[PDB]
Symmetry: D4
Subunit: 179 residues, 8 copies
């Protein structure tokens, strides 16, 4: 029974917490144990949701937060629809405005180290990359940040008020060393 | 008890499935038997709904998915309102922006054969024609596709993820030979 | 027990029917008896609602369908707020975009006779006037129709599909002679 | 058991009344006793809510109506996010469009006396100031009123219809002398 | 704008207040004016509802709170169904357990004076009579109180907590002199 | 467009009206045409629902108002479960308390003629029979009326208030001659 | 930011947690600080709710969890209704079956020490007393436990599964020393 | 993509299907693969739910369908509460009326072979055992079937209508050979 298991349950939305439990258990982890990654994948889920929420009402297509098999199914459908190269690892969104997939990251290092962790794994980085941080910075491909200046500020404000409430419970430092 | 009767029930929205059952029974068919056309008229209904959803909030007027008599009633009302020629077969939508009716098709042939099946039956093609396909192509009158580029991609992505889930159950090939 | 009492109940929205009953009883009439004016004030209510619905989300202020005293209260508040002359009879809407009140009419004569019935009663016609008809015409002050071309077509289409369903029950002719 | 305790309960929205009770009790007052300030902080809450409602869907961030500690938490998060000076007293909103905090006032004096009460207390008035009145005037920093002309008229119309219903119960004069 | 108009709105359930407004206006009175009888018919409605609630789930048939015409319609239906004498004034309930109509009263005199006011008007008192009071007494025909001892205590407790909240606002004495 | 089509829509519950439309169309009839049988099968449905409602919470199993195939499926399941003879025509309910099927009738003749119409068609009347009437009588097998005296009175009261509202619209006499 | 503040939020029902916050703040305490008594008054609230839930549907009258003033108001109403001595400290329930008030306790000592803490403070113990414990014992006046044997077991099972989840987070021992 | 994966999704309640997916994945199985046990644990869940539903409103305590850890937590709480021996394998219910745990089984063999599979594994069969079957038989400890005769018939009727719909799709025989 961890302090942060409770904080994750009380902090995020019940649907997001349920999807995080499902994804973590599908890839072999216990939210009651690997609690730091529990908070991480909750945060990642929420950031992706607010991202797809920013912009037009039906501009994005959510890939993260689905079943493995179904997420892939969507990716193949989009690929055949428009004519984009099938990604290598599962992306997080697809911009219909820019006809391109989007990988969303949330890290505790600088934008540079996280972007480096993601770009080489992307290899053929035919799909866009967008990083966020609990400090407030964001590195994105070709400095195209996709979203409005107001939607992105909302996301970082949220990222930081999470970091605050974690420090109020002396759980922030353990989160910083896990990544 | 057919496999695709279940797949149609689990795949589409309950309202769409109910309207498909109602329309098929009104024109003398059993969704438990003519199952391929069950999936077809479910798909047609859903595509029409997403179409009227794309664009402005109150830009389209749904004609398909109503009672025979009531659908006609609406058509006469629109006709008298604006001043457009009363169609010959029941159309699917009316664009208030373009002051014109719209016939929506979803086929398993090329855009050409379906468009040919529809245009001669339209005779006096005073009303627009718009075709869609499980491959991803679309033929439309005067190459005016009515909707935004992003709303139409959504529709075709959906059409294709349906085709996928059908192949996952070995039901796609039977669908292809029915049309 | 009249045929059109039932048709009015089954045709319009329950809230609109309830507000019509309330207004008619407040001004001394029985919806079970003066049934033609029952259908009339239902239609008037619905047309006003769709009107305030067309345009921006918070562009109009509904005056009809409120309590006598409260409706007036709103009018005084708007008057003091912007600086417009207090109307003489209770108006139906207020356009915040055009800073002007709006009187909405729905008649069975021509636009001319109804507009004449309303303008002289307006006397100091400082407030806008907008007429609608079951035929499909509309006369408005200075030929400024306030709303988009698509929102107004919706209203007239609705007005006409009502006229149809009335004729399907042989109740239209009695409606035409009541005005 | 005061007349205006009832009028406040019947006039405002239950959520707003509950938040007003919570804030007043947190800062040591009884809504059953300091009833004038009960109506005041209800009005202030509602005006702030309509303000954040005017404009874009996610343009503002509500600071008033939260817990003391949580409200501050949000302020620190916004501050770190964009890079604005941390206010001195707790502000009411943050404009993401204009990257600036907003203090909303509702007074019974002129715009001048209220604006004077707020500006010197702001000291380093790095954050915007916006006043409203039951008469209908509004003074704002640099004459930038932030919102559309139609959203602001709505607010003042509401402020005045409240003043009316108060006079209908002979409670307005007691409200005027409390400030 | 009366104090007790507000107290009635804030004290009773919105459906009960709406039905009271409807009945009072149907029999020619203004809840904003004849406010004491407003509170009275609200109380009468609520007492009848709790009465029909006490006992079995489908033991009673509500007659009060319906439209004049419809209430009568129900009475005729019950009369023909069982075989009971058609009442003279409109009763409030029908006990299916005891096969008898019930008239419910709520007074500010003693049980004796109210029971006397009701019995002679009943003339052929073929239907049961049940009185309640803000003091807590109850006179009933043949001392048959119909309901359980626990359901009736609930009703009187409610009647008295209303009398209290009225005294908290100095409105009780005006209520006592109106009857 | 019939008067009673409207009266049926406004009188019964939308679910019951929908199930009646479905059953009538499944057995080849138009509710807009065979309107008398529309009202009949609505009434039959409602009476069956109130019947299964009377008694214990899970005492009855509804057979009428289901799909043909599914209704039969249930019947076979009950038959195998308890050990009762499979009926010949589709029954309406099954009493789990009395381990016996129940056929519910609603007629405009006497209990005798309707009971005679049903018993010979039952042939091997191994299943119970229960008749109801718009007059208020009821004939049942072995004079076992299954339900409480209070639940059955409710049903007949409802049957009669329907007959009243029909006479208020001069539609009752046409109903009486159709059976 | 305490561990048990989170555990209390995630463990109990949001309404109960809100009422506990309200009562604690009304009697001058911070749920973010006096967290042990936060969990205590949450538990007390929940136990009282399940108690009033056990037994008949309308057998009990809830006194705890109301506003101070309103709770008293109810007590006076019950007192006048039945004829019971007005308690000295605010009781928790009133049994309408047994015509007596009930004080509910939940302690971490034995039933004896808690019962002793309550009885002398009751002085004139005209009202019933009922104790519960996280161990599972219960002392009650005259060994009359009021409720069924099954409703009381439910309460103690719940009390103990709370004690378990507290030990899973190493928060139980701090709870035991606070009383 | 299996036929019975679809049939399980369309046949059972979404909550039950979700809990079955969760339990199967927690004990290392894929509902898309071990589909027969998918239908099995769905059926087991539903039978347990109807069982706890039969009888008194709060007579049973559900153990199956919870998290492993939480289910155990409840068991320990009940054990300490009443004083029953802690079971060895996780039971399904606890009867508060009979103060005893209950293991529910649903098999495709005879009651004898399933009861034999369960009793020796129970070893110290201090807890009750209750078997059900798609044929309709039931073996229970000491021939005490716990529930009413009507609630148990409901369960078996449901078990058999499932077996029917499975045969309608030629999936029953594969289910019979899996156990
Ligand atoms: C909105 C999140 C957004 C996305 C949900 C939909 C829920 N699910 C569940 C499966 C089917 C489905 O559709 N998910 C998650 C899986 C893919 C997807 O689309 N939600 C939730 C409510 C409706 C909606 O759109 N946001 C944005 C801010 C925080 C938040 O919750
Ligand atoms: C929205 C579909 C859309 C259209 C429905 C409304 C439902 N009905 C039923 C009869 C009266 C009525 O209005 N239909 C169908 C008949 C004509 C019509 O308008 N719906 C459904 C919810 C509200 C709404 O607008 N979409 C778009 C994507 C998939 C989907 O379901
Ligand atoms: C929307 C109508 C619109 C206006 C209603 C709000 C309901 N009421 C009742 C009193 C308080 C209040 O607000 N009324 C009527 C009185 C003034 C007013 O505002 N409605 C209804 C749902 C929410 C909303 O906005 N439309 C447009 C098309 C048809 C229709 O019903
Ligand atoms: C909308 C008000 C607006 C703001 C509410 C959200 C409610 N709460 C409660 C705590 C968590 C939370 O979110 N509050 C208040 C605290 C900060 C905040 O955001 N509301 C209410 C409904 C949904 C929504 O957005 N308006 C505008 C006009 C009048 C009105 O009520
Ligand atoms: C329950 C009151 C009870 C009676 C209502 C039903 C509402 N209406 C409105 C017209 C059609 C209809 O049915 N009315 C009033 C008219 C006759 C009738 O039956 N209500 C209300 C909720 C559901 C229900 O049963 N109680 C008891 C305690 C206080 C209270 O509100
Ligand atoms: C209650 C009627 C009762 C029966 C309905 C359930 C609705 N449906 C639809 C299909 C699946 C399903 O379950 N039907 C009809 C088919 C068989 C059945 O069971 N209803 C309706 C609400 C919930 C419920 O139980 N009553 C009694 C008085 C009038 C009335 O409507
Ligand atoms: C049921 C609790 C019960 C009591 C609530 C009602 C809510 N409120 C809020 C104020 C007006 C009001 O009525 N309260 C609390 C104050 C007095 C009272 O009555 N609730 C809640 C839902 C409906 C209901 O009855 N239970 C029992 C188990 C746990 C639980 O929550
Ligand atoms: C009622 C099932 C019953 C039990 C559910 C409650 C849902 N959950 C989810 C977790 C917290 C919780 O409580 N579960 C499942 C886990 C233990 C438990 O209690 N349900 C569901 C609705 C409310 C309720 O009581 N039935 C009986 C017939 C079929 C059916 O669905
Ligand atoms: C080809 C298909 C799926 N059929 C189809 N139908 C329509 C349509 O409008 N049908 C209305 C009239 N109609 C007459 N006879 C009918 C019948 N037997 N089945 C259904 N509908 C019938 C489309 O618009 C469309 O794109 N595809
Ligand atoms: C003047 C008024 C109504 N009060 C008011 N208050 C605020 C506000 O933010 N208050 C937060 C901090 N605060 C500190 N002490 C407080 C106290 N005693 N009462 C309330 N709030 C207190 C406004 O923004 C505003 O426009 N008007
Ligand atoms: C005394 C009181 C409150 N009035 C009262 N009324 C009724 C009642 O049934 N009224 C129905 C018929 N009715 C005729 N004229 C009416 C009118 N002027 N006002 C209202 N109702 C009128 C009661 O049952 C009851 O207990 N108390
Ligand atoms: C007499 C009435 C109203 N009809 C009636 N029907 C049933 C019934 O069960 N019908 C099921 C089978 N069925 C076969 N042919 C049918 C057809 N043409 N119309 C409807 N139902 C048909 C009753 O139970 C009942 O009381 N009254
Ligand atoms: C011991 C405990 C948890 N406290 C408790 N309280 C009550 C109760 O009724 N309290 C109402 C009055 N009250 C006065 N001063 C108060 C204060 N400082 N905190 C809270 N309540 C206060 C119980 O009934 C009960 O079982 N346990
Ligand atoms: C035989 C069946 C369907 N399985 C079954 N299971 C249970 C049960 O409680 N299981 C809990 C523990 N458990 C341990 N290993 C497990 C595993 N591999 N799958 C599932 N559950 C597992 C029943 O009660 C019952 O009637 N039938
Ligand atoms: Mn990502
Ligand atoms: Mn089409
Ligand atoms: Mn008008
Ligand atoms: Mn402010
Ligand atoms: Mn009465
Ligand atoms: Mn039948
Ligand atoms: Mn029948
Ligand atoms: Mn207490
Ligand atoms: Mn207590
Ligand atoms: Mn089991």
């Amino acid at each position: 029974g961890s302090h942060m298991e409770d904080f994750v349950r009380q902090c995020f939305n019940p649907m997001i917490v349920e999807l995080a439990e499902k994804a973590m258990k599908e890839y072999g982890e216990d939210p009651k144990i690997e609690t730091n990654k529990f908070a991480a994948i909750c945060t990642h889920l929420e950031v992706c949701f607010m991202y797809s929420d920013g912009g037009s009402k039906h501009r994005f297509e959510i890939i993260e937060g689905r079943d493995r098999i179904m997420a892939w199914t969507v990716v193949n459908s989009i690929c055949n629809t428009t004519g984009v190269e099938k990604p290598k690892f599962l992306p997080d969104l697809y911009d219909y405005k820019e006809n391109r997939f989007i990988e969303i990251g949330v890290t505790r290092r600088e934008v540079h180290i996280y972007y480096l962790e993601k770009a080489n794994k992307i290899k053929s980085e035919k799909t866009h990359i967008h990083i966020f941080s609990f400090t407030g910075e964001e590195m994105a491909t070709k400095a195209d940040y996709t979203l409005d200046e107001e939607s992105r500020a909302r996301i970082k404000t949220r990222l930081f008020t999470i970091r605050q409430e974690m420090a109020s419970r002396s759980l922030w430092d353990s989160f910083r060393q896990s990544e």
